């Protein structure tokens, strides 16, 4: 449906293949896509299954960061040999965690890629950041530490916004104009 000039996507609980396919199609549509929390990406299958899949890949440059793992999946779904697919890649920014510039921006999700809406209950799935922890990535511990720090600050902002929202909500019914002409569904 409606689009935006730049899109920030929260990759928590999103399947790797499903999200990458939607992102790759959006990149070829000229949109600018920024994917945050790339280390919480989920892949269907046992963590043993993906460990050997990555270990087989280890046996070019074998990138270990979860963000570069996601970029590899997106890269394969683009015509990177041509200029059109080259420009699409430069319009994508995959990062782990939520950096400050995208910290205070709305983060949308893709229901077609969400694990809960796409994976059978009880199925074993592995987290990309957790999977990448035993392949060479050594920043998982600190990335989590900033994440809780960001969550505390984000929660404090939400309480301030919620407390402020209570003021307009209380004053919403105070004005008689709301009740007088609420026949329009508003």
């Amino acid at each position: 449906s409606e689009f935006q000039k730049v899109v920030v996507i929260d990759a928590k609980g999103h399947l790797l293949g499903r999200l990458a396919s939607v992102v790759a199609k959006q990149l070829l549509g000229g949109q600018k896509v920024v994917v945050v929390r790339c280390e919480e990406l989920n892949i269907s299958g046992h963590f043993f299954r993906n460990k050997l899949k990555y270990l087989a890949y280890l046996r070019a440059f074998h990138f270990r960061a979860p963000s570069r793992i996601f970029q590899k999946a997106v890269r394969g779904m683009l015509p990177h040999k041509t200029a059109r697919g080259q420009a699409a890649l430069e319009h994508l920014q995959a990062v782990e965690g939520i950096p400050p510039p995208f910290d205070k921006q709305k983060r949308v999700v893709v229901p077609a890629a969400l694990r809960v809406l796409r994976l059978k209950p009880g199925r074993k799935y592995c987290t990309v950041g957790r999977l990448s922890s035993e392949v060479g990535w050594k920043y998982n511990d600190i990335v989590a530490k900033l994440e809780e720090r960001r969550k505390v600050k984000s929660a404090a902002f939400y309480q301030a916004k919620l407390a402020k929202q209570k003021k307009i909500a209380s004053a919403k019914e105070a004005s008689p104009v709301n009740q007088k002409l609420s026949q329009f569904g508003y």
């Binding site: 449906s1 409606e2 689009f3 070829l28 549509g29 000229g30 949109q31 059109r84």
Partner: protein
């Protein structure tokens, strides 16, 4: 603020192509906000344009327009087929478009 925007935003996706053969005479246009072929029937026959700019100025204006008209829907997802007075360049894939509300039947 609030501009004018008497049109609908749209994107140029690709030409009417098979796997290995392209037909630049017809372009596939995604009118964003339209999600099915039945919804696409409203926008059939409307005037679509590609507004771009060139560094050289003509008559004191640096804006050039290629006019077209939406012909028929394409697929089940509301994408439409548009034919322009000049075939759209291949480099305008993913570029924005403007779908007017005229000619109107509402």
């Amino acid at each position: 603020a609030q501009g004018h925007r008497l049109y609908v935003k749209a994107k140029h996706l690709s030409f009417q192509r098979s796997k290995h053969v392209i037909h630049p005479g017809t372009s596939i246009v995604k009118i964003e906000g339209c999600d099915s072929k039945e919804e696409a029937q409203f926008y059939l026959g409307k005037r679509v344009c590609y507004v771009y700019k060139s560094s050289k100025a003509v008559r004191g204006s640096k804006i050039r327009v290629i006019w077209g008209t939406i012909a028929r829907p394409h697929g089940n997802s509301g994408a439409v087929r548009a034919r322009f007075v000049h075939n759209l360049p291949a480099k305008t894939f993913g570029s924005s478009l403007r779908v007017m509300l005229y000619p109107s039947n509402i």
